[PDB]
Amino acid sequence: MIIAIPVSENRGKDSPISEHFGRAPYFAFVKVKNNAIADISVEENPLAQDHVHGAVPNFVKEKGAELVIVRGIGRRAIAAFEAMGVKVIKGASGTVEEVVNQYLSGQLKDSDYEVHDHHHHEHH
């Protein structure tokens, strides 16, 4: 798995979480190897506060990912996940090296949100 985290700044491990994934300035895609971080990719956003389209997620959907750990987020970014079943854990607060601990520590989670009665079309 790779683990996305929108951060206010590229500060490696010390990257403090941003709220709004859809206009995060950087994406700290951490990894895991068995049960340890393995590796880090805090890459720039190609679209932090720029074109404003469905292309912020189109980028991270090439970045090989599996999990996302986000504070605020919104439905267009959920629709990125939802192309690829890419888990979106929500409600984190703190720093990237700690988010990854809070999840591995079992605490961090994604509640219950996949009611199958209603939609707004799909729309790719």
Side-chain angles (χ1 to χ4, degrees):
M1 106 198 325
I2 318 182
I3 297 136
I5 307 167
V7 285
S8 285
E9 288 297 345
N10 189 332
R11 309 210 175 192
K13 53 202 159 177
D14 24 298
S15 304
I17 196 152
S18 201
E19 179 170 337
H20 327 93
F21 175 91
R23 55 253 285 178
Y26 310 88
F27 285 149
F29 257 137
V30 196
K31 304 192 61 175
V32 66
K33 165 88 279 200
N34 177 74
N35 279 80
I37 271 67
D39 206 23
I40 294 269
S41 277
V42 195
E43 303 237 292
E44 291 86 346
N45 208 298
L47 283 157
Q49 249 281 77
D50 181 75
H51 214 138
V52 186
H53 242 48
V56 146
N58 196 79
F59 161 67
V60 284
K61 288 172 79 284
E62 100 93 352
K63 303 296 281 165
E66 265 175 61
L67 180 67
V68 199
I69 297 174
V70 282
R71 194 159 202 250
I73 204 148
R75 180 60 108 93
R76 179 73 74 213
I78 271 46
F81 133 37
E82 294 241 358
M84 37 173 57
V86 147
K87 181 103 85 246
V88 190
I89 280 174
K90 297 113 80 93
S93 57
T95 45
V96 163
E97 58 152 295
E98 191 216 76
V99 172
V100 175
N101 180 277
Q102 300 212 35
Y103 165 77
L104 287 181
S105 292
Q107 307 287 35
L108 220 62
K109 209 137 80 160
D110 63 298
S111 204
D112 183 335
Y113 194 70
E114 285 167 281
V115 294
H116 53 91
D117 73 304
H118 169 259
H119 57 312
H120 186 66
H121 302 253
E122 278 159 72
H123 193 288
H124 299 90

Short mmCIF file of all heavy atoms in Angstrom, two decimals, residues 21-71:
data_model
loop_
_atom_site.label_atom_id
_atom_site.label_comp_id
_atom_site.label_asym_id
_atom_site.label_seq_id
_atom_site.Cartn_x
_atom_site.Cartn_y
_atom_site.Cartn_z
N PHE A 21 -7.87 18.27 0.70
CA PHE A 21 -7.17 17.43 -0.27
C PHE A 21 -7.20 18.01 -1.69
O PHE A 21 -6.17 18.10 -2.34
CB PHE A 21 -7.81 16.04 -0.23
CG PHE A 21 -7.26 15.10 -1.28
CD1 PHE A 21 -6.16 14.27 -0.97
CD2 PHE A 21 -7.82 15.09 -2.57
CE1 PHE A 21 -5.61 13.47 -1.98
CE2 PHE A 21 -7.27 14.28 -3.58
CZ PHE A 21 -6.15 13.49 -3.27
N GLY A 22 -8.38 18.45 -2.17
CA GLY A 22 -8.55 18.94 -3.53
C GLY A 22 -7.72 20.19 -3.88
O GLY A 22 -7.61 20.51 -5.07
N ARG A 23 -7.15 20.88 -2.90
CA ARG A 23 -6.23 22.01 -3.03
C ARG A 23 -5.17 21.91 -1.93
O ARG A 23 -4.95 22.87 -1.18
CB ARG A 23 -6.97 23.36 -3.04
CG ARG A 23 -7.89 23.59 -1.83
CD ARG A 23 -9.38 23.48 -2.18
NE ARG A 23 -9.88 24.66 -2.90
CZ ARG A 23 -11.13 24.83 -3.37
NH1 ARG A 23 -12.04 23.88 -3.20
NH2 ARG A 23 -11.46 25.95 -4.00
N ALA A 24 -4.58 20.73 -1.75
CA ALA A 24 -3.39 20.55 -0.94
C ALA A 24 -2.19 21.00 -1.79
O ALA A 24 -2.14 20.62 -2.96
CB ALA A 24 -3.25 19.07 -0.58
N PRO A 25 -1.21 21.73 -1.24
CA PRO A 25 -0.01 22.13 -1.99
C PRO A 25 0.94 20.97 -2.32
O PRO A 25 1.68 21.05 -3.30
CB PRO A 25 0.66 23.22 -1.16
CG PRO A 25 0.15 22.97 0.25
CD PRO A 25 -1.24 22.39 0.05
N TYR A 26 0.93 19.90 -1.53
CA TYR A 26 1.80 18.74 -1.70
C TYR A 26 1.02 17.50 -1.25
O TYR A 26 0.07 17.62 -0.46
CB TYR A 26 3.07 18.89 -0.84
CG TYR A 26 3.82 20.21 -0.97
CD1 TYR A 26 3.46 21.29 -0.16
CD2 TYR A 26 4.88 20.34 -1.89
CE1 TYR A 26 4.12 22.53 -0.29
CE2 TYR A 26 5.56 21.57 -2.00
CZ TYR A 26 5.17 22.67 -1.22
OH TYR A 26 5.82 23.86 -1.33
N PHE A 27 1.42 16.33 -1.73
CA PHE A 27 0.85 15.03 -1.40
C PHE A 27 1.97 14.13 -0.89
O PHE A 27 2.81 13.67 -1.66
CB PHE A 27 0.10 14.45 -2.61
CG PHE A 27 -1.26 15.05 -2.96
CD1 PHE A 27 -1.68 15.08 -4.30
CD2 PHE A 27 -2.16 15.44 -1.95
CE1 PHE A 27 -2.98 15.47 -4.65
CE2 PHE A 27 -3.45 15.87 -2.30
CZ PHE A 27 -3.87 15.89 -3.64
N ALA A 28 2.02 13.94 0.44
CA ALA A 28 2.95 13.05 1.13
C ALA A 28 2.40 11.64 1.01
O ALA A 28 1.72 11.15 1.90
CB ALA A 28 3.08 13.48 2.60
N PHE A 29 2.61 11.01 -0.15
CA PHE A 29 2.34 9.60 -0.38
C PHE A 29 3.45 8.80 0.31
O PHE A 29 4.54 8.65 -0.22
CB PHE A 29 2.22 9.31 -1.89
CG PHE A 29 0.81 9.13 -2.46
CD1 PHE A 29 0.47 9.73 -3.68
CD2 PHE A 29 -0.14 8.31 -1.81
CE1 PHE A 29 -0.80 9.47 -4.26
CE2 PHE A 29 -1.43 8.14 -2.33
CZ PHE A 29 -1.76 8.71 -3.56
N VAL A 30 3.18 8.32 1.53
CA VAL A 30 4.06 7.39 2.24
C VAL A 30 3.77 5.97 1.75
O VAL A 30 2.73 5.72 1.15
CB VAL A 30 3.82 7.52 3.76
CG1 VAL A 30 4.97 6.87 4.54
CG2 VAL A 30 3.69 8.99 4.20
N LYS A 31 4.65 5.00 2.02
CA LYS A 31 4.42 3.60 1.68
C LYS A 31 4.31 2.79 2.96
O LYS A 31 4.23 3.34 4.06
CB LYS A 31 5.50 3.13 0.68
CG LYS A 31 5.50 4.05 -0.55
CD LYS A 31 6.31 3.57 -1.77
CE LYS A 31 5.86 2.25 -2.41
NZ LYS A 31 6.63 1.98 -3.64
N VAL A 32 4.27 1.48 2.81
CA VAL A 32 4.55 0.55 3.88
C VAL A 32 5.13 -0.70 3.21
O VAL A 32 4.75 -1.04 2.08
CB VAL A 32 3.25 0.31 4.69
CG1 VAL A 32 2.19 -0.42 3.86
CG2 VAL A 32 3.46 -0.45 6.01
N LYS A 33 6.03 -1.39 3.90
CA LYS A 33 6.63 -2.68 3.57
C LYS A 33 6.30 -3.49 4.80
O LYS A 33 6.76 -3.15 5.89
CB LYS A 33 8.15 -2.49 3.38
CG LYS A 33 9.05 -3.74 3.37
CD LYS A 33 9.21 -4.39 1.99
CE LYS A 33 8.02 -5.28 1.65
NZ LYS A 33 8.35 -6.25 0.59
N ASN A 34 5.46 -4.52 4.65
CA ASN A 34 4.89 -5.29 5.75
C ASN A 34 4.17 -4.39 6.76
O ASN A 34 2.97 -4.18 6.60
CB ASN A 34 5.97 -6.22 6.33
CG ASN A 34 5.48 -7.00 7.53
OD1 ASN A 34 4.71 -7.94 7.39
ND2 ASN A 34 6.01 -6.71 8.71
N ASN A 35 4.87 -3.84 7.75
CA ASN A 35 4.31 -3.04 8.85
C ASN A 35 5.16 -1.81 9.16
O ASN A 35 4.98 -1.18 10.21
CB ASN A 35 4.16 -3.91 10.09
CG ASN A 35 2.90 -4.76 10.05
OD1 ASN A 35 2.88 -5.80 9.40
ND2 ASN A 35 1.84 -4.38 10.74
N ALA A 36 6.12 -1.47 8.29
CA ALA A 36 6.98 -0.32 8.48
C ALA A 36 6.91 0.59 7.25
O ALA A 36 6.61 0.09 6.17
CB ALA A 36 8.41 -0.81 8.72
N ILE A 37 7.22 1.89 7.37
CA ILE A 37 6.99 2.94 6.36
C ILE A 37 7.55 2.56 4.98
O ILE A 37 6.98 2.94 3.96
CB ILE A 37 7.57 4.29 6.87
CG1 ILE A 37 6.54 5.11 7.68
CG2 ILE A 37 8.08 5.23 5.76
CD1 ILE A 37 6.13 4.50 9.03
N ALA A 38 8.64 1.81 4.92
CA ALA A 38 9.47 1.54 3.75
C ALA A 38 10.09 2.76 3.08
O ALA A 38 11.26 2.70 2.72
CB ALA A 38 8.67 0.77 2.69
N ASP A 39 9.29 3.78 2.75
CA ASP A 39 9.63 4.80 1.77
C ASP A 39 8.66 5.98 1.86
O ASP A 39 7.55 5.84 2.38
CB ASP A 39 9.46 4.17 0.38
CG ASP A 39 10.32 4.81 -0.70
OD1 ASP A 39 11.34 5.45 -0.36
OD2 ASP A 39 10.02 4.55 -1.89
N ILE A 40 9.05 7.13 1.30
CA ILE A 40 8.32 8.40 1.33
C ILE A 40 8.37 9.00 -0.08
O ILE A 40 9.42 8.96 -0.73
CB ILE A 40 8.99 9.34 2.38
CG1 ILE A 40 8.87 8.84 3.85
CG2 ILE A 40 8.50 10.79 2.27
CD1 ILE A 40 7.65 9.34 4.63
N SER A 41 7.27 9.60 -0.54
CA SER A 41 7.16 10.48 -1.68
C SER A 41 6.31 11.68 -1.27
O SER A 41 5.09 11.64 -1.43
CB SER A 41 6.49 9.71 -2.83
OG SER A 41 7.36 8.90 -3.60
N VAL A 42 6.91 12.75 -0.72
CA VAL A 42 6.22 14.03 -0.62
C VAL A 42 6.53 14.80 -1.90
O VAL A 42 7.58 15.44 -2.02
CB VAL A 42 6.56 14.82 0.66
CG1 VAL A 42 5.54 15.95 0.87
CG2 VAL A 42 6.64 13.94 1.91
N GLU A 43 5.64 14.66 -2.87
CA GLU A 43 5.72 15.32 -4.15
C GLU A 43 4.83 16.55 -4.12
O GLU A 43 3.82 16.61 -3.40
CB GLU A 43 5.28 14.33 -5.25
CG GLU A 43 6.10 13.02 -5.29
CD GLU A 43 6.76 12.75 -6.65
OE1 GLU A 43 6.04 12.48 -7.63
OE2 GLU A 43 8.01 12.70 -6.75
N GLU A 44 5.18 17.55 -4.92
CA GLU A 44 4.34 18.69 -5.22
C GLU A 44 3.01 18.24 -5.80
O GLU A 44 2.92 17.21 -6.48
CB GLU A 44 5.08 19.59 -6.23
CG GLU A 44 6.31 20.27 -5.62
CD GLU A 44 7.64 19.52 -5.62
OE1 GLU A 44 7.70 18.29 -5.85
OE2 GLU A 44 8.64 20.17 -5.24
N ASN A 45 1.98 19.06 -5.60
CA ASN A 45 0.76 18.93 -6.36
C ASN A 45 0.99 19.58 -7.73
O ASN A 45 1.49 20.70 -7.77
CB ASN A 45 -0.37 19.65 -5.63
CG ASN A 45 -1.71 19.03 -5.95
OD1 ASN A 45 -2.15 19.01 -7.09
ND2 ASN A 45 -2.36 18.47 -4.95
N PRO A 46 0.63 18.96 -8.86
CA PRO A 46 0.68 19.65 -10.15
C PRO A 46 -0.41 20.73 -10.28
O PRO A 46 -0.45 21.47 -11.26
CB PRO A 46 0.50 18.53 -11.19
CG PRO A 46 -0.31 17.46 -10.45
CD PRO A 46 0.17 17.59 -9.01
N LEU A 47 -1.36 20.79 -9.34
CA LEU A 47 -2.63 21.50 -9.47
C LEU A 47 -3.08 22.05 -8.11
O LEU A 47 -4.28 21.98 -7.77
CB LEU A 47 -3.66 20.51 -9.99
CG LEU A 47 -3.52 20.23 -11.49
CD1 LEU A 47 -4.16 18.89 -11.75
CD2 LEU A 47 -4.25 21.29 -12.32
N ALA A 48 -2.18 22.56 -7.27
CA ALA A 48 -2.48 22.88 -5.88
C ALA A 48 -3.59 23.92 -5.75
O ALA A 48 -4.42 23.85 -4.85
CB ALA A 48 -1.24 23.46 -5.21
N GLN A 49 -3.57 24.91 -6.64
CA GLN A 49 -4.41 26.10 -6.61
C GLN A 49 -4.23 26.78 -7.97
O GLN A 49 -3.63 27.85 -8.09
CB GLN A 49 -4.02 26.99 -5.40
CG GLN A 49 -5.08 27.06 -4.28
CD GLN A 49 -6.21 28.02 -4.64
OE1 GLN A 49 -7.08 27.70 -5.45
NE2 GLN A 49 -6.26 29.21 -4.06
N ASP A 50 -4.65 26.06 -9.03
CA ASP A 50 -4.23 26.35 -10.40
C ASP A 50 -5.39 26.08 -11.36
O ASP A 50 -6.36 26.84 -11.35
CB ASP A 50 -2.96 25.53 -10.69
CG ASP A 50 -2.43 25.78 -12.09
OD1 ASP A 50 -1.84 26.86 -12.33
OD2 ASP A 50 -2.64 24.88 -12.94
N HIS A 51 -5.39 24.99 -12.15
CA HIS A 51 -6.42 24.75 -13.17
C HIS A 51 -7.82 24.55 -12.58
O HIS A 51 -8.80 24.92 -13.23
CB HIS A 51 -6.02 23.54 -14.03
CG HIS A 51 -6.41 23.60 -15.49
ND1 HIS A 51 -5.58 23.22 -16.53
CD2 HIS A 51 -7.59 24.05 -16.02
CE1 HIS A 51 -6.25 23.42 -17.67
NE2 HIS A 51 -7.46 23.95 -17.39
N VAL A 52 -7.92 23.95 -11.39
CA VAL A 52 -9.16 23.52 -10.74
C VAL A 52 -10.04 22.69 -11.69
O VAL A 52 -10.95 23.18 -12.36
CB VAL A 52 -9.87 24.72 -10.07
CG1 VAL A 52 -11.09 24.28 -9.24
CG2 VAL A 52 -8.90 25.45 -9.11
N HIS A 53 -9.74 21.39 -11.76
CA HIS A 53 -10.57 20.41 -12.46
C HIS A 53 -10.42 19.04 -11.81
O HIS A 53 -9.72 18.90 -10.79
CB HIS A 53 -10.23 20.40 -13.97
CG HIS A 53 -11.43 20.80 -14.79
ND1 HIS A 53 -12.22 21.90 -14.53
CD2 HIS A 53 -11.95 20.14 -15.87
CE1 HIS A 53 -13.23 21.88 -15.42
NE2 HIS A 53 -13.07 20.85 -16.27
N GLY A 54 -11.05 18.01 -12.36
CA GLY A 54 -10.93 16.63 -11.91
C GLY A 54 -9.54 16.01 -12.16
O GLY A 54 -9.44 14.79 -12.18
N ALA A 55 -8.49 16.81 -12.32
CA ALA A 55 -7.15 16.35 -12.67
C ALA A 55 -6.20 16.22 -11.47
O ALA A 55 -5.25 15.46 -11.56
CB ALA A 55 -6.58 17.31 -13.71
N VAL A 56 -6.48 16.90 -10.34
CA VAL A 56 -5.79 16.65 -9.07
C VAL A 56 -5.81 15.14 -8.75
O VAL A 56 -4.75 14.58 -8.50
CB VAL A 56 -6.41 17.50 -7.92
CG1 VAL A 56 -6.41 16.86 -6.52
CG2 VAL A 56 -5.74 18.86 -7.82
N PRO A 57 -6.98 14.48 -8.74
CA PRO A 57 -7.04 13.05 -8.49
C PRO A 57 -6.53 12.24 -9.67
O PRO A 57 -5.94 11.18 -9.45
CB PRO A 57 -8.51 12.75 -8.20
CG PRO A 57 -9.31 13.90 -8.80
CD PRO A 57 -8.30 15.00 -9.05
N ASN A 58 -6.69 12.72 -10.91
CA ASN A 58 -6.20 11.99 -12.08
C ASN A 58 -4.69 11.74 -11.98
O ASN A 58 -4.23 10.65 -12.31
CB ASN A 58 -6.57 12.71 -13.39
CG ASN A 58 -6.41 11.77 -14.58
OD1 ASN A 58 -7.28 10.94 -14.83
ND2 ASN A 58 -5.33 11.87 -15.33
N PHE A 59 -3.94 12.72 -11.45
CA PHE A 59 -2.54 12.58 -11.07
C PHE A 59 -2.35 11.46 -10.05
O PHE A 59 -1.72 10.46 -10.37
CB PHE A 59 -2.00 13.94 -10.58
CG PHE A 59 -0.73 13.88 -9.74
CD1 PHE A 59 0.48 13.47 -10.32
CD2 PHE A 59 -0.77 14.25 -8.38
CE1 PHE A 59 1.66 13.44 -9.55
CE2 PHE A 59 0.41 14.22 -7.62
CZ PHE A 59 1.62 13.82 -8.20
N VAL A 60 -2.88 11.57 -8.83
CA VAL A 60 -2.61 10.59 -7.77
C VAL A 60 -3.10 9.16 -8.11
O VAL A 60 -2.59 8.18 -7.57
CB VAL A 60 -3.16 11.07 -6.42
CG1 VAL A 60 -2.28 12.17 -5.79
CG2 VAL A 60 -4.58 11.61 -6.49
N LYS A 61 -4.05 9.00 -9.02
CA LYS A 61 -4.47 7.72 -9.59
C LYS A 61 -3.43 7.09 -10.53
O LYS A 61 -3.57 5.91 -10.86
CB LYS A 61 -5.81 7.86 -10.31
CG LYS A 61 -7.06 8.06 -9.41
CD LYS A 61 -8.29 8.38 -10.26
CE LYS A 61 -8.93 7.14 -10.92
NZ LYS A 61 -8.19 6.63 -12.09
N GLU A 62 -2.40 7.81 -10.96
CA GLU A 62 -1.23 7.23 -11.60
C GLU A 62 -0.17 6.90 -10.54
O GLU A 62 0.70 6.07 -10.75
CB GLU A 62 -0.72 8.16 -12.71
CG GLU A 62 0.49 9.05 -12.39
CD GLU A 62 1.87 8.46 -12.76
OE1 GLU A 62 1.98 7.28 -13.15
OE2 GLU A 62 2.85 9.24 -12.77
N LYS A 63 -0.24 7.49 -9.34
CA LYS A 63 0.78 7.33 -8.31
C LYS A 63 0.55 6.06 -7.49
O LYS A 63 0.82 6.05 -6.29
CB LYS A 63 0.82 8.60 -7.43
CG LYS A 63 1.07 9.90 -8.22
CD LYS A 63 2.44 9.97 -8.90
CE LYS A 63 3.51 10.34 -7.85
NZ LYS A 63 4.90 10.11 -8.29
N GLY A 64 0.12 4.98 -8.15
CA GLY A 64 0.17 3.59 -7.70
C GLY A 64 -0.51 3.28 -6.36
O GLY A 64 -0.16 2.29 -5.72
N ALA A 65 -1.40 4.15 -5.87
CA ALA A 65 -1.77 4.21 -4.46
C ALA A 65 -2.77 3.14 -4.02
O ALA A 65 -3.26 2.35 -4.83
CB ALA A 65 -2.26 5.62 -4.16
N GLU A 66 -3.09 3.11 -2.72
CA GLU A 66 -4.01 2.15 -2.11
C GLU A 66 -4.83 2.82 -1.00
O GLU A 66 -6.05 2.73 -1.02
CB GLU A 66 -3.24 0.97 -1.53
CG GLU A 66 -3.16 -0.22 -2.49
CD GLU A 66 -2.27 -1.32 -1.91
OE1 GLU A 66 -2.60 -1.85 -0.83
OE2 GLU A 66 -1.13 -1.48 -2.39
N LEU A 67 -4.19 3.47 -0.02
CA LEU A 67 -4.84 4.18 1.08
C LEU A 67 -4.65 5.69 0.90
O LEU A 67 -3.70 6.16 0.26
CB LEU A 67 -4.32 3.66 2.45
CG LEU A 67 -4.93 4.31 3.71
CD1 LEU A 67 -6.41 3.96 3.88
CD2 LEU A 67 -4.22 3.84 4.97
N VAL A 68 -5.54 6.46 1.50
CA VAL A 68 -5.52 7.91 1.62
C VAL A 68 -5.91 8.20 3.07
O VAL A 68 -6.79 7.52 3.60
CB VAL A 68 -6.50 8.52 0.59
CG1 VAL A 68 -6.18 10.00 0.34
CG2 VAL A 68 -6.50 7.84 -0.79
N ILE A 69 -5.27 9.16 3.73
CA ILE A 69 -5.54 9.58 5.10
C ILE A 69 -5.64 11.11 5.07
O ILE A 69 -4.67 11.80 4.78
CB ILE A 69 -4.47 9.06 6.08
CG1 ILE A 69 -4.46 7.51 6.15
CG2 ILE A 69 -4.78 9.65 7.47
CD1 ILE A 69 -3.32 6.92 6.99
N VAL A 70 -6.84 11.63 5.30
CA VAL A 70 -7.21 13.00 4.97
C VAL A 70 -8.02 13.64 6.10
O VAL A 70 -8.71 12.95 6.85
CB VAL A 70 -8.00 12.99 3.64
CG1 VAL A 70 -7.06 12.83 2.44
CG2 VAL A 70 -9.06 11.88 3.61
N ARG A 71 -8.01 14.97 6.21
CA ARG A 71 -8.69 15.64 7.31
C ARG A 71 -10.09 16.09 6.91
O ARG A 71 -11.07 15.54 7.42
CB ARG A 71 -7.78 16.76 7.82
CG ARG A 71 -8.24 17.30 9.17
CD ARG A 71 -7.10 18.01 9.90
NE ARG A 71 -7.37 18.04 11.34
CZ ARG A 71 -7.68 19.09 12.11
NH1 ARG A 71 -7.79 20.31 11.61
NH2 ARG A 71 -7.84 18.91 13.41
#
